[PDB]
Design an enzyme around this catalytic site. Structure first.
Site, PDB file in Angstrom:
ATOM      1  N   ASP A  35      -6.647   1.467  -3.711  1.00 16.03           N
ATOM      2  CA  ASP A  35      -6.169   1.911  -2.406  1.00 16.03           C
ATOM      3  C   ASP A  35      -6.238   0.787  -1.373  1.00 16.03           C
ATOM      4  O   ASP A  35      -7.301   0.533  -0.812  1.00 16.03           O
ATOM      5  CB  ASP A  35      -7.026   3.092  -1.943  1.00 16.03           C
ATOM      6  CG  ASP A  35      -6.601   3.645  -0.600  1.00 16.03           C
ATOM      7  OD1 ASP A  35      -5.484   3.304  -0.153  1.00 16.03           O
ATOM      8  OD2 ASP A  35      -7.380   4.456  -0.032  1.00 16.03           O
ATOM      9  N   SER A 199       7.936  -4.813   9.630  1.00 16.30           N
ATOM     10  CA  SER A 199       9.235  -4.861   8.992  1.00 16.30           C
ATOM     11  C   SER A 199      10.295  -5.169  10.031  1.00 16.30           C
ATOM     12  O   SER A 199      10.175  -4.799  11.199  1.00 16.30           O
ATOM     13  CB  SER A 199       9.517  -3.531   8.295  1.00 16.30           C
ATOM     14  OG  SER A 199      10.854  -3.428   7.844  1.00 16.30           O
TER      15      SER A 199
END
EC number: 3.4.23.22
Length: 330
Positions: A35, A199
């Protein structure tokens, strides 16, 4: 040193991935959920409340000659999906894919929430976010990666998750045969303890690319792609019959649909998520309403590039003094 381990979807939907991890001496192999959105290595154990164990493999520290109680240390964690666990702490030898760390904090669960109990395939979590998020008190502990880093050939790990197929976690090297083209690197902020990056935009299907900054986290422990409501609405508007259902808890779509791809930007590069990756199947057995793999982050408080996004790429988690993230197509 390096390590290399195969990671395997737990079910037919890729709801999560498990990776075998050797703990203790002799080795006890547990299948952990790696994770990159948390920083605790915790396991089902011989100390876990018996009624909360349902098929998991447990770590038994008393059977490990290298286990040592970390006196006074406790841990307690709550995850974004509302699940939780807590317990005490041992140090022991932990190996992943041939890479060994001695003195790793192994957090033994005394209690786990129902979501964990009900998932027989996940024996615990191995956190790979920054150690500043580790929950051990009163002395915070380091992640497996942080402990391994100095010994690694290069201070990196890579995630190469499969779509409905196994994939690979590598430590200490970049497998140049595992991706196509070049790796595009992008800046990381560690201010929130995550692999947080921005992004450069998105496209839906064959549509034009929208240049827009989307701050989010690369999180292998989250199944879906959570993005701003504007972006998600633009995606699902291209699927006839798709709608957001408060009763179901997100966007659903007719199972008869063909889903468009979703592209996200990494600098000037583009990662394309095929439409099929966005299908999470019937909401309930036999239903003709299917659950979407792109959902709104509104009210999560953060955008999350979870498995839906990451499995479309070869992803480098670069833990150099100034960390960065790399993405390549594959």
């Amino acid at each position: 040193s390096t390590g290399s381990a195969t990671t395997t979807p737990i079910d037919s939907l890729d709801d999560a991935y498990i990776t075998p991890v050797q703990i203790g001496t002799p080795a006890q192999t547990l299948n952990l959920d790696f994770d990159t959105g948390s920083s605790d290595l915790w396991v089902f154990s011989s100390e876990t409340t018996a009624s909360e164990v349902d098929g998991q493999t447990i770590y038994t520290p008393s059977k490990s000659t290298t286990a040592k109680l970390l006196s006074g240390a406790t841990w307690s964690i709550s995850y974004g999906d509302g699940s939780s666990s807590s317990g005490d702490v041992y140090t022991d030898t932990v190996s992943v894919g041939g890479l060994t760390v001695t003195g790793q904090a192994v957090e033994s669960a005394k209690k786990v929430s129902s979501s964990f109990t009900e998932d027989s395939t996940i024996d615990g979590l191995l956190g790979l976010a920054f150690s500043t998020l580790n929950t051990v008190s009163p002395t915070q502990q380091k992640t497996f990666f942080d402990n391994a880093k100095a010994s690694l050939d290069s201070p990196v790990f890579t995630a190469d998750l499969g779509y409905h197929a196994p994939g690979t976690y590598n430590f200490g090297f970049i497998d140049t045969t595992a991706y196509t083209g070049s790796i595009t690197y992008t800046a990381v902020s560690t201010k929130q303890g995550f692999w947080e990056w921005t992004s450069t935009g998105y496209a839906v299907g064959s549509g034009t690319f929208k240049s827009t900054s989307i701050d989010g986290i690369a999180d292998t422990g989250t199944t879906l792609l959570y993005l701003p409501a504007t972006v998600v609405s633009a995606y699902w508007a291209q699927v006839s019959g798709a709608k957001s259902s408060s009763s179901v808890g997100g966007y659903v779509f007719p199972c008869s649909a063909t889903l468009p791809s979703f592209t996200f930007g990494v600098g000037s590069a583009r990662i394309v998520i095929p439409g099929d990756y966005i299908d999470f199947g019937p909401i309930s057995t036999g239903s003709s309403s299917c659950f979407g793999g792109i959902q709104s982050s509104a009210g999560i408080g953060i955008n999350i590039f979870g498995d839906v996004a990451l499995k479309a790429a070869f992803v480098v988690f670069n833990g150099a003094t100034t960390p960065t993230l790399g993405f390549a197509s594959k």
